[PDB]
Write a protein that binds this ligand. Sequence first.
Ligand SMILES: Nc1ccc(S(N)(=O)=O)cc1
Length: 1723
Amino acid sequence: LAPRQVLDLEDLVFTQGSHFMANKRCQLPDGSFRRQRKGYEEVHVPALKPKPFGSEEQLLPVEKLPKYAQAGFEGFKTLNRIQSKLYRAALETDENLLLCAPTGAGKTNVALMCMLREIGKHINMDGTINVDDFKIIYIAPMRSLVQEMVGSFGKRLATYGITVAELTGDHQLCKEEISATQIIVCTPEKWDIITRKGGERTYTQLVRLIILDEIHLLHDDRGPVLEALVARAIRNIEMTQEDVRLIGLSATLPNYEDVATFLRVDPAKGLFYFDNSFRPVPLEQTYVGITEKKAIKRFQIMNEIVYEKIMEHAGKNQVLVFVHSRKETGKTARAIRDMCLEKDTLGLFLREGSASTEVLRTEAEQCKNLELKDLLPYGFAIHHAGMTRVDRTLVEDLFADKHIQVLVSTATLAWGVNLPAHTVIIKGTQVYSPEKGRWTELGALDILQMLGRAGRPQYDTKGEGILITSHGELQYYLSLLNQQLPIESQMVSKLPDMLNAEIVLGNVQNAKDAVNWLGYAYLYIRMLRSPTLYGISHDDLKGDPLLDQRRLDLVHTAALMLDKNNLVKYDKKTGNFQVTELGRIASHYYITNDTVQTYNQLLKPTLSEIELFRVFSLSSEFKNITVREEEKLELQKLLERVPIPVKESIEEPSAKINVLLQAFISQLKLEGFALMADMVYVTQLAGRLMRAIFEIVLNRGWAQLTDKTLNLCKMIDKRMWQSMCPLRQFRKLPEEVVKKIEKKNFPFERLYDLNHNEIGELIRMPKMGKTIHKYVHLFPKLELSVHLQPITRSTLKVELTITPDFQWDEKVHGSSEAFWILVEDVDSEVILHHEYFLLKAKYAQDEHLITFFVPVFEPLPPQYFIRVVSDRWLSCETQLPVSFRHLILPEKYPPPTELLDLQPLPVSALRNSAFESLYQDKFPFFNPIQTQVFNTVYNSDDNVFVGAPTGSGKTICAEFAILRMLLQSSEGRCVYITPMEALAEQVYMDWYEKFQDRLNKKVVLLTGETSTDLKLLGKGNIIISTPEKWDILSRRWKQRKNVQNINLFVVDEVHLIGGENGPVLEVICSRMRYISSQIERPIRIVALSSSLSNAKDVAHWLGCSATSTFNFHPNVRPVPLELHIQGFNISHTQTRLLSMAKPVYHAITKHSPKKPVIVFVPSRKQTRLTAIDILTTCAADIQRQRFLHCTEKDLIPYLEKLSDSTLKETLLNGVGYLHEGLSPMERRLVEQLFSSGAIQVVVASRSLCWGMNVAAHLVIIMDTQYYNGKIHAYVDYPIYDVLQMVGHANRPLQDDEGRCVIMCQGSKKDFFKKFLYEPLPVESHLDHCMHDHFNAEIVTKTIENKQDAVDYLTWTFLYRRMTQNPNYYNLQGISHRHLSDHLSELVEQTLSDLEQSKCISIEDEMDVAPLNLGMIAAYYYINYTTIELFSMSLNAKTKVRGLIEIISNAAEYENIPIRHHEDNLLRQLAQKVPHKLNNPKFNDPHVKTNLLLQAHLSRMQLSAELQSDTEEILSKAIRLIQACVDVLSSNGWLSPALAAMELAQMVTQAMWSKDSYLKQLPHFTSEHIKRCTDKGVESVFDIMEMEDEERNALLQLTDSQIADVARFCNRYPNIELSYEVVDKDSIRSGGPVVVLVQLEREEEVTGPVIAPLFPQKREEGWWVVIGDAKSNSLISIKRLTLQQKAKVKLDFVAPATGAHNYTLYFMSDAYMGCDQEYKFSVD
Ligand SMILES: Nc1ccc(S(N)(=O)=O)cc1
């Protein structure tokens, strides 16, 4: 860091702004002549003769340019000279251009050619244009110019089918229909504001081309805005590494080549400069300058000058007279009218049609308003933006058809429309500037544009340009209009405000980056090329050619200002910058840094409305405003009429600004023309300044001032006071009708309770009654409902339900309405919590559930208030008290168990040498938690709880308990449960190699199927399982011996009991406790957990003493964690995500530049995007490959495996990523490289946070929400997922500390600050999941009566918490009476539900018994509502089609998620599948499971996540189908039962009901089968009996293909069937009939069922069925799995009268074409 020096900026700045001329000298063309007059002097420069054509360079006729570019040039047959000299550069290259041409030369159509080139790269063959793939931004300088640019461009690109729309003004949070526009047209200041936001990439992602029209605005006071835009754009292009083409369009002024440098233009390829010869129509010009200072006489001179120049054009010649006041237009038109008539009606009949050549047309349109009507009968007309509206557009008409001879207009016309006159006269050049608080000389931009309206391109060969101005000082205008006024940099003027925008953006983090930023500015180039202009000496430049000192000084000076005004924290030493919230707001709302200081110094929570209007007045953007003498009176009359007192402020600027704002809200008409210009200036600014004060004050939680300031923003926008009728906000309601309701002492709210007749009677306007009714019901209105529940004594969880109660109209509300959810304390003094809420039109009249947490303080208040205020509408709010009167706070939690700084335990504390051998090579001692826990877990047989921050190494704490069991028992039995499967598979691998390879005990992992799980539980010493797998086993604990005699039972992550799928965990742990006390040979419970606030309750529950319960606080974590929480106030998720991109990189460089980093992102697509962004930012930081820590050839053997191209590319650059579309191998590979240190950064999706055996030094969580398609909203990550992610920032061996940065919405910030720094409180949710467990317990006779059900509950964790946190479970009170009452009402409701669902029977009000439906639900582990639904929907006539629908409606498929835009995807799927659904909602998980079920049968391949869902669906499809069989057989329906069995075999093989049986064979296709049906092969048996040479002769093959096909036929069921009727003769009506089926196969069975498309290995299952096919009668059924051979017995009851015809059916649940049928008869 080099020494610095503070500069005087007011000395280096070009004070005079745009009017600055560094052009000390000057020259003139050939015609020099000047005429001296009395009062003034005339200067003449003649129109340049046209330059002869150069070598070739002929005009390019439209046919020459490409066929696709033909369109958009209708009306043209050839291109202009300019447009031809660069058709090649514009259309055939992508090079950056800078075009210098005179105004009117047609630079427009050059830019259009550039635009058409971009459109040309998305022609799409037959589809019109890939319109959603690109975007073009067009920066124009004036608002009026923008609007007509849109008009014209739309006319040219309609044939292309392209949307070009305006984006300028103040419309904040601009509509997402900008996604529908491809050419955004705007002003620089607007585009600067949009790109200051951060999420800019949401707009600019697709921007392939930006155009800078009238780029010579650089020299203007507005110039820095242009410098910022381009410097920002250029830098962003470097950071995305995505090409954006820049086109500069400029007027012919000096320094242009330096602008070409600025725009990264190649001088040789993309620079074009054309002098004044290339004007559209040659211009003869007069520059009259007045030498007379006397004010009144000065303007008489001027008026005399206008007069005589007009008259040199009598008949067929039009004159435009530009002036500089909305009203001066008339006082000049009538003045020349007074000048002409007075001197003998001078040259009248301007329209030389005394007999109506243009009089008949000018008197026919005469009935248009005020001054127009006056001047219309003859040649005079007028034009201004003075709200003249459609008149001025029909003045454009008549002036176009050259009827109107003389038009005097404001500058607006010159930019706004395309009408040129033969001669133009500009009068005065003086302009009032509200910002400077005075008159100044007008903008170079303005002059150039209007003077370039001289000479009609088609109707004129010459143009006359008269510029009237003051003689003194002004040949400025001559050099301006004759290629001589240079373009300079004004950057010093606005340096601190620009610096701040770049700091807030994250683009500059310190002084160093700041001087680099300056290097991208236009200022830099100019300081190098003209150091003397910019206050630098040639000697400084010589010894410092890059201007390091100057740029550092410049930056340091600015930074000091920003630090002083509290926008930026800046220290002299490091040169580092820190953004403050004040700076963030200042940048975003474009407010100068002086103002921020004032606001900060003045705003306080008790500001009055009177004082708030004062603070607005003191804003620095008003600092030059004064109170003139000639307005003193009008100001005093305004004051009396406005409502807010303006105290102590006499007529000072402060007071004037104050009443100017009030007068604007009050809609008071003005007459003072200086005053009107000042009002437009403060009122156009008032929106942003107010909104800035709003955000400042909202963020400090200031309740009263947030209300005041928000209302103030709404009042300025709606132009009405808060105390008028809300109905004024509807524009289409006649204003006198509204003032009529205000004239009553009548609350608006009451209109809701009146019909259209009572309303009409109230206003005594009967006609108006119905419309007022309509609008009353259009007004936004929300209803609120709250659901409260205490989490701890300091915090409560709040579920706010928001219910829209109004009629939606898109003409009034548009596509959405926004609201602020605020929660305030009792006194309404503090905002405890707030958040934005967006009510989309799509989901109006739809419930909305917002969940959040609020703080509370032990001497509790009676109420909090929740207000939901609209962000745009006045008087649109709804309030809801939240009573704390009956609130019961939870029991205060005990202190954490003290961490004992013991001497670290050595590995030799394990005495066993075999045991030590698997720890000694990794580490010498155990961590302080491991050593403290050691004596109790390794030298006891008793129950223990371990609560430590995730990462503390709790895994081996359980390993202690396992080793200790192995010591005690030879063939010990240990069951380990983890809530997550991905965790189970991780511990398996880790313990298999530890306990089976090293120690040779058995380690097994339970699976989906029960039989093979029972054997695994048999021979296993270590049983790994998830809770449901163990639930389905341990239900039958009475019957399965192996479940009882287990020695050690381990539960990991027991805090997950509080989460989703937590009840099943709670059930099985409780069962294990019950078994233990009921067998009197205790089972050892070891429970591992994250730090719990309520560990005592978990300890008591699992039978742990306090001395054997270890619960450590998060701040005692072996490796100290440094946690940072970073909020982003951005509601729109996709935007928020994008704006996190840079902070992600900055976190890596700040917190872990050398050590490993994991970045968690919310999705698959984001994982790839984030990694690519890190890479591209790396390269723009010039440190490309800085995350690679080996050579490329080190990686290449591993990368060769991978099949993702992009994954190779990123890894090659040091960054990996992990999503679920990668192979399990590809993921193992990436993890290996990461752990090795080779690659420094992995980006992973959150779903993978459980299945990653990888640790970093820095974990970054990039957003904490994900999309829920089911409720059309983004929802928060479970705190369990976040805790798990954070636990990854943990490397005990190498790191002194772990770091974690969590990036989230501001609405989520306070939440993380609580539940990450403190132990986590957990509750049960078993009460909302009670049915399936009661049903199972009743089926196994563990529950026989109501009392047993109450007793069962005493073993749960639910039972414990109910006393501790009653209001959480809806216990109104904590007495023992309340507990029993609740437990009883709970068992009552559950048992009554189970009975109504036909699962159980309640008898004598106390006893319960299992029924058929209950028994099948427990047997297949199916939810009770599912088999309730099955029995409800199944009938005698259901086919496979209805079966699929029924099964996909199961409640197990309720948790199949709907993801972002999966609806569009599923809608397409619906049109591709065989069966079409009726009224299908595409955000319905059951609709999706249906579609996926058909997609799987049709062998379609889909998105990766749709295939994961297809796998989840299939993982349950078989058990559900078997249930259907059971229910159908119970009802005795034959056909549906057989159908369900076909479904099982056709789900397995993944084929349809009438698909060829050959599809089961590998490698076969419809191409193959076609030649198989032709020869006569239809069955699998038919290829089986074929002899080898003939077999592969049928079609194509390979040695490996035939090998697989043959392998299939050796596992295919070759079974022979044999049957007999036992005592077939002595059988009688009503008696028993016994059918004995013998099954045997000519093969010894070994090998699972082969089914590549079914993702769960299953064994052959069979149904033996007997039926009557005539009556559709299922007589008897049996389900079996046979192995080699087996005897099957099944009986039934004989009917009457002898002979009956029966059928025996043999049915697979795994293969098609195996089904055998045998018919027979009896009696
Ligand atoms: N402007 C703004 C402020 C706060 C939030 S918040 N609290 O919802 O994140 C969003 C936008």
